[PDB]
Ligand binder design. Sequence first.
Ligand SMILES: [Zn+2]
Ligand SMILES: [Zn+2]
Lengths: 48, 48
Amino acid sequence: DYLRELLKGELQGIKQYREALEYTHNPVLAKILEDEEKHIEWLETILG
Amino acid sequence: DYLRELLKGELQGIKQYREALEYTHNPVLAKILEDEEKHIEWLETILG
Ligand SMILES: [Zn+2]
Ligand SMILES: [Zn+2]
């Protein structure tokens, strides 16, 4: 069950990071959420 | 307050990923958890 508990939680971060560039205007979010966008599918691609 | 909400729970992934490789045995967690280890200090560094 742990994989689904993992996968549900990274999705909770992708949508919040896309808001934060309005207040930070930084290139850091163009690395952080750029990784979180791949990460969910990166865990999943392994399963089969 | 959004920054506190962003920061606190990336470690609710980092420690979980470190255990999950004992079941998965895959190099992808050495890209997922490799990046979550940066992600917290990445968004924390900007406020200085
Ligand atoms: Zn991630
Ligand atoms: Zn993260």
